[PDB]
Amino acid sequence: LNRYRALIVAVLTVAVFCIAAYAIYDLTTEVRYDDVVHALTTTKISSVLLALLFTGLSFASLIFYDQNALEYIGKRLPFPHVALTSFSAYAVGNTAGFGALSAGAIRYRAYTRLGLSPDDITRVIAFVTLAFGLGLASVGAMALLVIADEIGPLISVDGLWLRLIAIAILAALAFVVYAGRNGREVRIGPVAVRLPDSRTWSRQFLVTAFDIAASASVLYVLLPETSIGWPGFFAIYAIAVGLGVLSHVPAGFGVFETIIIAWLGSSVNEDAVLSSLVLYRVIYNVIPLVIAIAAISVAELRSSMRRIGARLMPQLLSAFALLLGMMLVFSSVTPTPDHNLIVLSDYLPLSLVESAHFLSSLLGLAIIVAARGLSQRLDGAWWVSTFSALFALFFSLLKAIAIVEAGLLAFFVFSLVVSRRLFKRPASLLNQTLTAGWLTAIAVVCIGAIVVLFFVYRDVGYSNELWWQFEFADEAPRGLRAALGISIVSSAIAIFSLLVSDDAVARAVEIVRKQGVADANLVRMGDKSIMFSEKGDAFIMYGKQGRSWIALFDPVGPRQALPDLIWRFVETARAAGCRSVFYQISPALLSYCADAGLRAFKLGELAVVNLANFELKGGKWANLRQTASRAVRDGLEFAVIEPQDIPDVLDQLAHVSDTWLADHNAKEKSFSLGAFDPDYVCSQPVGVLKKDGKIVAFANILMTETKEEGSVDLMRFSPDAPKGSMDFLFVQILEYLKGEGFQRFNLGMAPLSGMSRRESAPVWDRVGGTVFEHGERFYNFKGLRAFKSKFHPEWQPRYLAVSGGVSPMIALMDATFLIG
Amino acid sequence: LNRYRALIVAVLTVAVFCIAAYAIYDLTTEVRYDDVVHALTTTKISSVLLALLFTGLSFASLIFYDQNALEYIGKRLPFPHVALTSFSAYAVGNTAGFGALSAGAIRYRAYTRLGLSPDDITRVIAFVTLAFGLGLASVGAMALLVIADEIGPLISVDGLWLRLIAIAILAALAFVVYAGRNGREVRIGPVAVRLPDSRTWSRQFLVTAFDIAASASVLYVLLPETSIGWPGFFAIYAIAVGLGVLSHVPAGFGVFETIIIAWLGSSVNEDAVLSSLVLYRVIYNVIPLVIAIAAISVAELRSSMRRIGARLMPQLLSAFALLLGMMLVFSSVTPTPDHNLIVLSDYLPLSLVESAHFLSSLLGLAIIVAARGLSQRLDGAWWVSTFSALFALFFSLLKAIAIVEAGLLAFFVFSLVVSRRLFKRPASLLNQTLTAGWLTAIAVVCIGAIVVLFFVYRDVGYSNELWWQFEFADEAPRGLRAALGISIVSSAIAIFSLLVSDDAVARAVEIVRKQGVADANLVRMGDKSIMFSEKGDAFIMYGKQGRSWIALFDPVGPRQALPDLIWRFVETARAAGCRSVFYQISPALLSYCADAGLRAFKLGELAVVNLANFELKGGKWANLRQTASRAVRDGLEFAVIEPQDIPDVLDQLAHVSDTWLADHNAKEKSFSLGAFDPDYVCSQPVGVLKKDGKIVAFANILMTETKEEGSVDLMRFSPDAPKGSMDFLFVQILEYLKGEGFQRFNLGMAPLSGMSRRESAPVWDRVGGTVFEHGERFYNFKGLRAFKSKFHPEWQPRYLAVSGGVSPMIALMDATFLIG
Ligand SMILES: CCCCCCCCCCCCCCCC(=O)OC[C@H](COP(=O)(O)OC[C@@H](O)COC(=O)[C@@H](N)CCCCN)OC(=O)CCCCCCCCCCCCCCC
Ligand SMILES: CCCCCCCCCCCCCCCC(=O)OC[C@H](COP(=O)(O)OC[C@@H](O)COC(=O)[C@@H](N)CCCCN)OC(=O)CCCCCCCCCCCCCCC
Ligand SMILES: CCCCCCCCCCCCCCCC(=O)OC[C@H](COP(=O)(O)OC[C@@H](O)COC(=O)[C@@H](N)CCCCN)OC(=O)CCCCCCCCCCCCCCC
Ligand SMILES: CCCCCCCCCCCCCCCCCC(=O)O[C@@H](COC(=O)CCCCCCCCCCCCCCC)COP(=O)(O)OC[C@H](O)CO
Ligand SMILES: CCCCCCCCCCCCCCCCCC(=O)O[C@@H](COC(=O)CCCCCCCCCCCCCCC)COP(=O)(O)OC[C@H](O)CO
């Protein structure tokens, strides 16, 4: 199932949007586009201003969503930063909720820039998401319970049934809250939700209820004085928003309008409802994006607001470009007023006007294609989107008057040229499998355009001669040609999207010795494809598995050459149509990974012992001294074999490794743990534990010339060894490394402690459990966490960075299979 | 103004109730009592069961009111105790909200039994009261904001005006919340409200909103399928409840019904609204009292629930008796069905039936008179109420069938005889000025009966021959005679309610020496009236001022003889028509004061130095050793003068006292501080500080034979003394007392520290400020708090107990005037 999870969820989303579009088309048979436009023109200025006010109130409540999340996890951040990240995250989530533009992605980027651990960012995202979903369910259930007899008749449903649905929902929520009184993680199968204390989720319930009330008030004020009061439309709006977010359609664009049109058909004229929905979409979705984009652009023109806005601009501009191209496509489909048509006919040629219409349509589709590249800071995407926006500005001033269209396009161009510096990546737009979410957006825009064409020109029949009509008489030929062009080019886009050595290892080892990370010596295994930097200074060892390029530890090389290497690895993985995965990265590289659109997830702690402060003849290692002394009394001796004179000992090294592999029912792992390749083990010094002449324990010592850090990859123990062989081998290797001039020693990886997992996300479902399972499977081959704690090391968190907003499940499983 | 505050507030409450009653009478001109009864009989059983369910839900939310208050102050109490005290407090507050039956009084009694400090009880009461009031204002304002256009037309008011009222209220509340972000006590003139943190008041807002929703749902379900939805009636109900609680009428009995009748006149037939209001009053007010009373009675029949219910039973029974007598009066006014009338005529004599009607009316009035005595655990009140209830049971089975009336009366008798033990006090019902609140209740019941008579027999004219009609034809003669009897007897009740030595001091001093409280020696001043115990073992020194018998320190004498003395003092003060006040009582007597209906308020801390652990040659008194040594180097010497050889030194004792009184611009206080009476000072040993032959400082040493504790009353310092005379005199007296065999020494009283006042009530208005002002005025004549802290004493809180639920302002001011 998860082999095609993205494809199946995208197909289901497009199918649900198709059902919604058909429902709107069927429910608006008596509504004509002229009636919709007349309702739009007759809307009161008071209504629009009051809708703007309630949009502002809703987004303030969203700011407090994020504020409450940060307060719950304990972190304190300055209010301008939290307000800006919350406003941007919600302005993009309410518009484009798929992978790179989800509110979670915005929050991760901004909070990583703001100085939050990935666990803290995950906790904030989980708190906010569970808050919105659960509070929306609760508020909708209470509103439905209140007014089932007032809004039930509108859809010819008895109020008792809606009341019972609301009661069932409220009973489920009450059972969840009561079963999760004080901690006490309740499991509903895969998910394991741990609700906050009553005070926190109570304040969050006020925040979420006020948010939903303000948004419903936006749309209600934009409605033309209906018969149902505010509570009625509020429950209707809560149900519609719940269904829209549950359908995974971007912004719920189909389902929300479908539900509201289907519901208010009897109460309000559907042309007025459609005009109100159009104006609500415009205000509540475009105006926040325009406000955020303009604020950041002005801050760039003229403190820390500038830096956080620079971090957030690529995604805000990607969302705005998606909306802008959607606008261009829809405006191509919808007809120009006759007055504007005759005005342009008085000045412009016919062929120029028709070509401008078709090109504006195709340029809108090109803009929503290049929006993904804008989200990735692509220089080519900046050029394509800038020129497409400028040409569409001109072609909208030509194919019509398009005052607001031209204003929006010019504002996009302004914000795009003001933020030029942020788009410098050299990857190519047309060399990438786009996304399940991005093809979902393309398909939604295209099908919406087709349905809008069928709705606008429903009265006019489909004549085969309508294709070639040109003489300004009607834009049905123009709309039909634009829709055909959109369909063809989008199908082309979808079709296009769905259609080692020895010197490398040598240079990698040269780089490894030139730097100070001992674990980089795993490149010698030869099973990792090596990706070198542009200068060759740094490299990224990686292995390909499934649909992911699972990179190993941090890019190895000079410090300043690492961010560009991370960017280049991610872009190259996308070029091969794969999602880049960084396995076991240090916290130092999280910000650079975050810029590359990679979200990190903690999967263990790397035990580091500082050899400068390690003196075994001290009180901090009493159990260690006892175990070492008893091992000495058992007859074990430790020697360091140089890599050149190994093989005569390598033969029974293979013997002891095979015996230890037989002793514990485990296979030979790779790509992250020691694999007994005779050349690999020969290439490095091997600390070996010898007893009674024969050797019973050995451990590949990982070293670097700079002597910043040393480590051990694999160690094996024959049953002839005593129980303290592990402790004695570690102590001897650590002492040898300290004597030789090493600052720190890497004990390896350990799974996260239970106390660390206690402060976990409110709504994480399987990520924590699968991280724990992976840690148990792979990190216990070199001593348990208690054993490594016996050395009193400096625990360093290690993270798993995944790309494209994909789930940690699939990347973690791909890494698990690559190791196994 | 405060000289007659109780009278003016009672008169205003009765006037507001009269306006409300006239409004109901004017709004129900077209409604006949037969229509009301028909609507009552035709109510659906489903409606009644669902109203019971929502009453239960509302009272659960009230339990959580008190739970949230206790959580906010930090105290943890077992849930059964909190639930029982909250249920009882709200069942009585929703019915009889005046002095002895307010929810605050119930909470103080129960929480004192549960082990809460009076400051903690004050904080809980303030949190709960501010929660209800502020949350009701907020929820009503939001509901009105939502539906001003849906409920505005019902009273012919434009929705814009109700919306603007709601917006003004919400703006005021938002300004208060924002101005009180983190602590930051906001002052609105007299009051100083410090809102809790957002999480606490958010959970409390959910609790209060659910409470109001459940109560509004009770009444809405009891309504007959109106045209306005639940939000409409909910805002109407919130406004009605706000006005009812704001009018101080018991249970809002007039104003709530007035508002709802006036509002729903157009939507619903007013006979149906009146029936719904009657049934809502019955359910939501009687059923909780019946439930609590029955639960406690069963617990008495068959663990700690029994003890807390025994504590709460007198007040629950007083509230139930008030409702029961109200029922009896109303049933006397309202007519019996003709079928029951002919059934009783078939078996009973005419004169017996008419006498039973009149006597049932007068017995209901007698029951609501004896309810106050029941609240005071009076044995005579138990007898009067029991016999009145039994005779009214029989007279209701005689004057009518009265199945529910007889059931309620029999249940009252059952609960009254089951809880017989609790009513043992020997005071007299008819020897007390009743209360402003109790005359308010009497007047409300009487005026309601008069208006119900005018409403039932509005169609029938007022014929002078209606007085003497007797032959079962109609109960208009019976109702008119009963109403006249009620009016006459209530006027009689209101008219009736509004219409030292040397051997005593000798016996008081004998008791003082026989016990171990040194401060009891203030009785020797002779200005305190002395009230001895029945055996004469113990006494209460007290002084009368204003309308209060301001008792001094704890009753002096044997430990077990004190509770009865406290009870007897309170009862005697009520007999003289005065509110007993206990000044500076120890925490040990709070529970006994709480049983006597006295609520304590902390007014300072009494500094106690344990002489057993006091060794001046230790590090704990370095500043003391330095000051004593410097005073010695200044030439001051300390001597102890026995009480018999004083006067030769008393002459310049008067000299030095006069000089010190002149030095500090203060007068000669009394009743709590040292007054220079030559006999008084002669009667006790006087530690005197002599320098260069003359004496410059002296201090009346207060002693007891049992040597449990010693103290000092007044000390004076001529300007010839140095700055350390106070310290040296205290140190010398303390050392002398320790040597003579005293366990502890009383430094005196100090005002509360600022840190102590930081954990103050959310909504206390003037009590804290006036307590601080009184402490500053009176407790700084013997060294400041820092000075007394230089001795490192054991701070003991001292409380001010006031009676009858009167405000601490007036009792504290009376004490201030008595001292000055
Ligand atoms: C009736 C419900 C009972 C159970 C039904 C089935 C259960 C299945 C459980 C599925 C779990 C999650 C699935 C995918 C959710 C997801 O992937 O997202 C997470 C989202 C936060 O998302 P996010 O935090 O990122 O952003 C939020 C904002 O931006 C997006 O809203 C917009 O689009 C804006 N345009 C409008 C908002 C305006 C506010 N200013 O939370 C959720 O799970 C949502 C769950 C909601 C559940 C349905 C609510 C039903 C209403 C109650 C009435 C019931 C009556 C039913 C009768 C038919
Ligand atoms: C299932 C799918 C089918 C659809 C169902 C949904 C129902 C509706 C939902 C909302 C759709 C709206 C989209 C349409 C936008 C568009 O067609 O634009 C055109 C307009 C003006 O354009 P134009 O300038 O050319 O008109 C000329 C004028 O200005 C000059 O006339 C004057 O001034 C007057 N004096 C003359 C009066 C003459 C009278 N005869 O744009 C706007 O409304 C504002 C710009 C914002 C548009 C962006 C919309 C995107 C929001 C959607 C969010 C969902 C996100 C999903 C992502 C996948
Ligand atoms: C519109 C308001 C704005 C300002 C108006 C004037 C301000 C004056 C301020 C006066 C301060 C206090 C005065 C005396 C209050 C008092 O002495 O008491 C304290 C009580 C808790 O009392 P308590 O805790 O003891 O018990 C509670 C329960 O038992 C009693 O309720 C019952 O009787 C039950 N039968 C029914 C309850 C069912 C629940 N289960 O809180 C308060 O201050 C109350 C203040 C309320 C303010 C008015 C609310 C207005 C609604 C908003 C809509 C406005 C529209 C206006 C249009 C005209
Ligand atoms: C992450 C966000 C999640 C938001 C979820 C919102 C869900 C709201 C609707 C469901 C609420 C069901 C509550 C039913 C009671 C269950 C028992 C219970 O919860 O007991 C808790 C206490 O229960 C409550 O206090 C409940 C308060 C709310 C009561 C229900 C209100 C529902 C909403 C009513 C709105 C009505 C409005 C009408 C007028 C507009 C125990 O609390 P604790 O000990 O965990 O608290 C620890 C403390 O915080 C530490 O400081
Ligand atoms: C003692 C009980 C008092 C109850 C009072 C209830 C009043 C509710 C109505 C008025 C609310 C006005 C709030 C306006 C915002 C003012 C700014 C503000 O309050 O900032 C605070 C934060 O503001 C908020 O979070 C406000 C949350 C609620 C937002 C407003 C909701 C109003 C109710 C809407 C219901 C809508 C329902 C419609 C559908 C039914 C700061 O909090 P803090 O730092 O003091 O918190 C400390 C923390 O708790 C320590 O742990």
DSSP B114-158: HT--HHHHHHHHHHHHHHHHHHHHHHHHHHHHHHHHHHTGGGT--
Q: Between the CA of residue A813 and those of A11, A774, A804, A819, B17, what are the distances in Å?
A: 24, 8, 16, 10, 75
What does the radius of gyration of chain B's CA atoms come to, in whole angstroms? Answer: 31
Q: Which of A198, A200, A202, A204 to mutate to test the pocket of ligand 4 (most atoms within 8 A of CB)?
A: A198
**Burial class of residue B468 (count of CB atoms within 10 Å of its CB; 0-12, 13-18, 19+):** exposed
By alpha-carbon position, which residue is closest to atom 9 of ligand 2? A278
To the nearest 10°, the Cα dihedral for A288, A292, A297, A302?
A: 120
By alpha-carbon position, which residue is closest to atom 24 of ligand 3? B129
Taking the CA of residue A230 and the nearest CA in chain B, the distance in Å comes to: 6
User: What are the percentages of helix, strand and coil residues in chain A, rounded to 5?
Assistant: 65, 10, 25
Q: In B, which residues are within 8 Å of A231 by CB distance?
A: 146-147, 229, 231
d(CA A440, CA A774): 32
> Which tokens belong to A664?
């514990």
d(CA A380, CA A427): 7
Handedness of CA A97, A100, A105, A109 (dihedral sign): negative
HEC string for A15-70: HHHHHHHHHHHHHCCCCCHHHHHHHHHCCCHHHHHHHHHHHHHHHHHHHHHHHHHH
DSSP-based three-state secondary structure for A481: helix
d(CA B314, CA B594): 13
Q: What are phi and psi of B423, to 5 degrees?
A: -105, 90
| Nearest alpha carbon to residue B480 among B494, B499, B461, B493 | B461
The position carrying tokens 């001597």 is: B639
| Nearest alpha carbon to residue A52 among A283, A255, A219 | A283
Contacts of A172 (CB under 8 A, 6+ apart): none
Candidates A146, A202, A206; nearest CB to B231: A146
**Can you state the angle between helices B403-418 and B304-333, rounded to 10 degrees?**
150
d(CA B103, CA B125): 8
Angle at B415 between CA B409 and CA B420, to 5 degrees: 125
Give the H or E element holding residue A669. none
What does the radius of gyration of chain A's CA atoms come to, in whole angstroms? Answer: 31
Distance, CA B433 to ligand 1 centroid (Å)?
Answer: 64
The position carrying tokens 């652009």 is: A297
By alpha-carbon position, which residue is closest to atom 23 of ligand 3? B129
> Which tokens belong to B421?
């033990």
Give break positions in chain B: residue before each, C–N beyond 2.5 Å.
302, 499
First to last CA, chain A: 21
Evaluate whether A216 touches A237 at the Cβ level (below 8 Å): yes
For residue A552, the Cα-to-chain-centroid distance in whole angstroms is 20
Q: Which of B64, B67, B177 to mutate to test the pocket of ligand 5 (most atoms within 8 A of CB)?
A: B177
Task: Identify the experimental approach.
Answer: cryo-EM
> Which tokens belong to A634?
């058992």
DSSP-based three-state secondary structure for B618: coil
**Burial class of residue A483 (count of CB atoms within 10 Å of its CB; 0-12, 13-18, 19+):** buried
Q: Between the CA of residue B621 and those of A411, B591, B627, what are the distances in Å?
A: 77, 36, 10
Would the CB atoms of B205 and A200 count as touching at under 8 Å?
no
For residue B692, the Cα-to-chain-centroid distance in whole angstroms is 57
Evaluate whether B68 touches B200 at the Cβ level (below 8 Å): yes
Q: In B, which residues are within 8 Å of A203 by CB distance?
A: 198-199, 202-203
- Chain B: residue nearest A72 by CA? B199
Nominal resolution (angstroms): 3.0
Q: Which of B9, B124, B246 to mutate to test the pocket of ligand 3 (most atoms within 8 A of CB)?
A: B246
Q: What is the DSSP letter of A525?
A: G
Q: Which residues pair with A798 in a beta bridge?
A: A604
- Residue spans of alpha helices (H) in A457-586: 476-498, 503-514, 562-575
Taking the CA of residue A573 and the nearest CA in chain B, the distance in Å comes to: 46
> Which tokens belong to A667?
């296979």
Cβ neighbours around B463 below 10 Å, total? 11
d(CA B809, CA B397): 49
- Chain A: residue nearest B149 by CA? A229
Where b means 16+ CB within 10 Å and e means fewer, A7-26 reads: eeebeebbebbbebbebbbe
Candidates B198, B206, B231; nearest CB to A231: B231
Q: Which residues pair with A608 in a beta bridge?
A: A746, A794
Give the number of residues written for chain B: 820
Contacts of B521 (CB under 8 A, 6+ apart): B509, B512, B684, B702, B703, B704, B711, B713
Count each helix (H run) and each strand (E run) in chain B, helices first: 30, 13
The position carrying tokens 């019509």 is: A400
Per DSSP bridges, beta strands B744-750 and B709-717 are parallel
Q: In A, which residues are within 8 Å of B198 by CB distance?
A: 203
By alpha-carbon position, which residue is closest to atom 9 of ligand 1? A246
Long-range contacts of B408-411 (CB under 8 A, 24+ apart): B408/B286, B408/B290, B408/B324, B408/B327, B409/B324, B411/B290, B411/B293, B411/B294
| Nearest alpha carbon to residue A702 among A726, A654, A737, A650 | A737
Q: Between the CA of residue A36 and those of A277, A480, A668, what are the distances in Å?
A: 10, 20, 68
Q: Which residues pair with B808 in a beta bridge?
A: none
| Nearest alpha carbon to residue A99 among A339, A450, A363, A376 | A376
Candidates A198, A199, A229; nearest CB to B147: A229
Q: Which residues pair with A215 in a beta bridge?
A: none
Q: Between the CA of residue B363 and those of B328, B334, B356, B395, B488, what are the distances in Å?
A: 8, 16, 10, 9, 14
Q: Structural domains in chain B?
A: 303-499 (no CATH), 503-603 (3.40.630.30), 608-750 (3.40.630.30)
For residue B630, the Cα-to-chain-centroid distance in whole angstroms is 52
Cβ neighbours around A649 below 10 Å, total? 16
Evaluate whether A743 touches A707 at the Cβ level (below 8 Å): yes
DSSP-based three-state secondary structure for A485: helix
DSSP-based three-state secondary structure for B307: helix
Give the H or E element holding residue B715. strand B709-717
Angle at B748 between CA B742 and CA B752, to 5 degrees: 135
Evaluate whether A578 touches A547 at the Cβ level (below 8 Å): yes
d(CA B377, CA B368): 15
Would the CB atoms of B147 and A230 count as touching at under 8 Å?
yes
Atom of ligand 2 nearest to the CA of A322: 57
Atom of ligand 2 nearest to the CA of A451: 3
Contacts of B551 (CB under 8 A, 6+ apart): B540, B541, B542, B569, B580, B581, B582, B583
Q: In A, which residues are within 8 Å of B146 by CB distance?
A: 229-231
Q: What are phi and psi of B786, to 5 degrees?
A: -60, -40
Q: Between the CA of residue B666 and those of A281, A329, B661, B716, B770, what are the distances in Å?
A: 76, 90, 6, 12, 19
d(CA B787, CA A533): 76
- Chain A: residue nearest B216 by CA? A146
- Residue spans of alpha helices (H) in A499-621: 503-514, 562-575, 590-595
By alpha-carbon position, which residue is closest to atom 21 of ligand 5? B198
Distance, CA B135 to ligand 3 centroid (Å)?
Answer: 9
Candidates A147, A150, A202; nearest CB to B206: A202
Q: In A, which residues are within 8 Å of B149 by CB distance?
A: 229
Q: Give the ligand at the shortest distance from the Cα of A241.
A: 1
Contacts of B46 (CB under 8 A, 6+ apart): none
Evaluate whether A87 touches A292 at the Cβ level (below 8 Å): yes
DSSP-based three-state secondary structure for B348: coil
Would the CB atoms of B229 and A198 count as touching at under 8 Å?
no
- Residue spans of alpha helices (H) in B152-229: 159-179, 198-222
For residue B275, the Cα-to-chain-centroid distance in whole angstroms is 34
The position carrying tokens 């090294």 is: A653
Where b means 16+ CB within 10 Å and e means fewer, A684-710 reads: bbbbbbbbeeebbbbbbbbbbeeeebb
Taking the CA of residue A2 and the nearest CA in chain B, the distance in Å comes to: 41
d(CA B537, CA B558): 7
For residue A699, the Cα-to-chain-centroid distance in whole angstroms is 39
Angle at A212 between CA B147 and CA A275, to 5 degrees: 80
Would the CB atoms of B149 and A229 count as touching at under 8 Å?
yes
d(CA B144, CA A384): 53
d(CA A747, CA A712): 7
DSSP-based three-state secondary structure for B795: strand
DSSP-based three-state secondary structure for A125: helix
B178 CB within 6 A, ligand 5: yes
Per DSSP bridges, beta strands B186-187 and B192-193 are antiparallel
By alpha-carbon position, which residue is closest to atom 38 of ligand 2? A337
Evaluate whether A758 touches A566 at the Cβ level (below 8 Å): no
d(CA B385, CA B371): 7
d(CA A7, CA A417): 35
A445 CB within 6 A, ligand 2: yes
**Burial class of residue A643 (count of CB atoms within 10 Å of its CB; 0-12, 13-18, 19+):** middle
Would the CB atoms of B200 and A199 count as touching at under 8 Å?
yes
d(CA B83, CA B90): 11
Q: In B, which residues are within 8 Å of A232 by CB distance?
A: 229
d(CA B373, CA B325): 14
> Which tokens belong to A127?
């708190």
Would the CB atoms of A147 and B203 count as touching at under 8 Å?
no
Long-range contacts of B228-231 (CB under 8 A, 24+ apart): B228/B150, B228/B151, B228/B154, B228/B264, B228/B267, B229/A146, B229/A147, B229/A149, B229/A150, B229/A229, B229/A231, B229/A232, B229/B150, B230/A146, B230/A147, B231/A146, B231/A147, B231/A229, B231/A231, B231/B143, B231/B146, B231/B147, B231/B150
Handedness of CA B659, B662, B664, B666 (dihedral sign): positive
DSSP-based three-state secondary structure for B710: strand
d(CA B118, CA B191): 20
Distance, CA A280 to ligand 2 centroid (Å)?
Answer: 11
By alpha-carbon position, which residue is closest to atom 11 of ligand 5? B174
d(CA B218, CA A292): 48
Q: Which residues pair with B798 in a beta bridge?
A: B604
> Which tokens belong to A63?
């700011």
Per DSSP bridges, beta strands B579-585 and B794-803 are antiparallel
Q: Which of A145, A147, A233, A245 to mutate to test the pocket of ligand 1 (most atoms within 8 A of CB)?
A: A245
Cβ neighbours around B271 below 10 Å, total? 21
* A-B C-beta contacts closer than 8 Å: 42
d(CA A428, CA A432): 8
The position carrying tokens 């009701």 is: B136
